[PDB]
């Protein structure tokens, strides 16, 4: 679990969005596993606007933050799970690192701010849904 709080927006994994999130929807994209809902109070997370490929992510299944190198946002095949059929997920970045189902929502950050959140994993890999292209989160 986990979310990004920027301005009057809450960014979560679409597959983990609560009933309150759908009742206050701003934008969602199943192909990116992202959902943005509106908030009453202002959030303090700063979104990164960069092309960094190194950062630190939070891994709830280890209660630890790990430094990682990660790929550029890409269209990547994700096998069928309990949340989606087999499909290509867009804007996804992979890194070599531990992740389990329960770790989705963990933040990935670089020196410029929030880069994305854990969205996929398996086989000693961890994948993050990029948010650096969503310029509108800043306004």
Ligand X SMILES: CSc1cccc2c1N(C(=O)N1CCC[C@H](C(N)=O)C1)CCCO2
98 is in an annotated binding site: no
Is residue 110 close enough to count as binding Zn ion by CB under 5 A? yes
What is the distance between the alpha carbons of residues 106 and 117, in angstroms, rounded to a whole number? 5
Active site residue 104: yes
Choose, from 33, 91, 103, 130, the residue flagged as catalytic. Answer: 33
15 is catalytic: yes
Cβ(48)–Cβ(112) below 8 Å: yes
Which of ligand X, Zn ion, none sits in contact with 50, Cβ below 5 to 8 A by type? Zn ion
Strands (E), 14-112: 25-29, 34-44, 54-59, 64-69, 74-78, 87-96, 107-110
137 binds, among Zn ion, ligand X, none (CB under 5 to 8 A by kind): none
Joined tokens for residue 47: 């979104």
Q: Which of 59, 103, 104, 130 is catalytic?
A: 104
Query: Quick one: tokens of 105?
Result: 């929502």
Q: To the nearest whole angstrom, how small is the minimum distance from the Cβ of residue 66 to Zn ion?
A: 17
Which are the catalytic amino acids? 15, 33, 104
Q: Which residues bind Zn ion (CB under 5 A)?
A: 48, 50, 52, 110, 112
């Amino acid at each position: 679990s986990g979310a990004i709080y920027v301005g009057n927006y809450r960014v979560v994994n679409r597959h983990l969005a609560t009933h309150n999130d759908w009742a206050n929807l701003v934008w969602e994209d199943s192909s990116r596993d992202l959902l943005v809902s509106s908030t009453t109070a202002q959030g303090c997370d700063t979104i990164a606007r960069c092309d960094c490929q190194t950062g630190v992510y939070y891994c709830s299944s280890r209660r630890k933050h790990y430094p990682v190198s990660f790929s550029k946002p890409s269209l990547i095949f994700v096998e069928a799970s309990e949340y989606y059929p087999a499909r290509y997920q867009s804007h996804l970045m992979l890194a070599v690192g531990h992740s389990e189902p329960g770790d989705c929502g963990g933040i990935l950050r670089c020196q410029h701010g929030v880069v994305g959140i854990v969205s996929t994993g398996g086989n000693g890999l961890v994948g993050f849904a990029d948010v650096r292209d969503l310029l509108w989160l800043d306004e």
